[PDB]
């Protein structure tokens, strides 16, 4: 079996054996830095078969040494579980993280991307547009919605790389810190629950507490990846976004020429991005199933390589060039299935802001250096730049 990952991510280079494999063998027995081997899925038919179909299942991996690029499993709270128990945390979310309130954080949100550039522009040139704008802007986002206090961020945002991290981490310091981040959260939910706030974990320790859903675990497990989420994967995707326009002028002269194309924009660095290093969580068979000429047997694994998918000839045209015109995109950065993603309508709200903001705020904005320069964040399961030095 081939030792899985082939190469270390570099940049947002995408490896050309990806190619390879849909054109010739679709799917591959690999080798896991950790747990069992597994099936690597690289197609986007067989992508939504593995996310969708009830034949494959999430909670099984816990019952394996699940396939995987971490040292321990990650505590993936609801994106672990099948129904029943993923129906009973999805139906609590879908109680409290509603569109409405994703709408009413709208003004803000805008106020927060001004304010960030009013520092930026008070500081002078050159600007980190990753530790002085999309990190924070992506943190006092979700902070506010769940009630996290953003000025705890000095104790908590040294903890959240331990959900993450591939080969940086000792597994010794991965329980630590995945102890003191539920810890953490589970404190907060003491106070949350004599003190109600507008936000989503005082909501859910109240719809929880009312109906009795919810042990405080599965609450306090829940809310560390809703933060983990808002935090770290909004301003992995947003920063390697702005890279992505950046070392593409032709399409951003399109898009500041043309404001209406921002939405399909977002949807087209959600596909083009391939922001997941590898592969999303793994996934096991509970029948026999065949896909692309290869019989996974039940009990095997599959890994779910979402950014192939999302580079996969037979749906998208040119699927290698970046066109944020592009209107047919059936992408899978969100997802598919039973598990898609219940952020994105935020996410996608977060991206336009940042965006539009940063685009009619900074005209001139542009990268400061050569990007062979830049400097990436290695040995995490997301891709992401520490640091997007700017002009304007
Ligand atoms: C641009 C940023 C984001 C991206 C690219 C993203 C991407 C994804 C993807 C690909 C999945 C599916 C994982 C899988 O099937 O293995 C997912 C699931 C999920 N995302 Fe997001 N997400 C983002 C932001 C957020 C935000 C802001 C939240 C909420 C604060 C969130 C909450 C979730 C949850 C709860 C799930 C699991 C849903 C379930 O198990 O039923 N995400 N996301
Ligand atoms: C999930 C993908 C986007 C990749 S694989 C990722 O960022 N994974 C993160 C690091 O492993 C963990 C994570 C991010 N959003 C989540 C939502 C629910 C449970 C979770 F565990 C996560």
Not at 276 to 288: L, P
Request: aromatic share 6%; glycine share 4%; proline share 7%.
């Amino acid at each position: 079996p081939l030792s899985y990952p082939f190469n270390e991510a570099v940049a947002l280079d995408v490896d050309p054996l990806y190619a390879k494999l849909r054109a010739e063998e679709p799917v591959v027995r690999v080798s896991c830095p950790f747990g069992e081997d597994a099936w690597l899925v690289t197609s986007h038919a067989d992508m939504k078969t593995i996310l969708a179909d009830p034949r494959f299942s999430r909670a099984l991996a816990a019952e394996h040494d699940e396939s995987r690029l971490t040292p321990l499993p990650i505590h993936t709270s609801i994106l672990g579980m099948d129904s029943p128990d993923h129906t009973r945390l999805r139906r609590l979310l879908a109680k409290v993280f509603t569109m409405r309130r994703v709408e009413l954080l709208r003004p803000r949100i805008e106020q927060e991307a001004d304010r960030l550039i009013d520092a930026l522009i008070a500081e002078g040139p050159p600007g980190d547009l990753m530790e002085g704008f999309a990190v924070p802007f992506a943190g006092t986002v979700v902070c506010d919605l769940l009630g996290v206090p953003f000025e705890d961020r000095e104790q908590f945002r040294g903890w959240l790389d331990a959900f993450s991290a591939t080969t940086v981490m000792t597994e010794e310091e991965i329980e630590a810190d995945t102890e003191r981040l539920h810890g953490y959260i589970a404190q907060l939910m003491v106070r949350r629950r004599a003190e109600p706030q507008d936000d989503l974990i005082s909501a859910m320790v109240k719809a929880s507490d009312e109906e009795e859903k919810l042990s405080e675990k599965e609450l306090v497990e829940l809310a560390s990846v809703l933060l983990i989420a808002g935090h770290e994967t909004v301003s992995s995707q947003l920063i390697d976004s702005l890279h992505v326009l950046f070392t593409h002028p032709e399409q951003l002269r399109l898009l500041k020429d043309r404001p209406e194309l921002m939405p399909g924009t977002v949807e087209e660095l959600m596909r083009f991005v391939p922001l997941i290093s590898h592969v999303t969580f793994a996934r096991y068979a509970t029948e026999d199933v065949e896909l692309s000429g290869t019989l996974v047997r039940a009990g095997e694994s599959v890994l779910p390589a979402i950014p192939s998918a999302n580079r996969d000839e037979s749906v998208f045209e040119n699927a290698d060039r970046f066109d944020l015109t592009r209107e047919h995109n059936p992408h899978l950065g969100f997802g598919y299935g039973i598990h898609r993603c219940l952020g994105a309508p935020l996410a996608r709200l977060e991206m336009q802001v940042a965006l539009d903001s940063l685009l009619r705020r900074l005209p001139e904005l542009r990268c400061a250096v050569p990007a062979e320069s830049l400097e990436w964040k290695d040995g995490m399961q997301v891709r992401s730049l520490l640091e997007l030095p700017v002009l304007w």
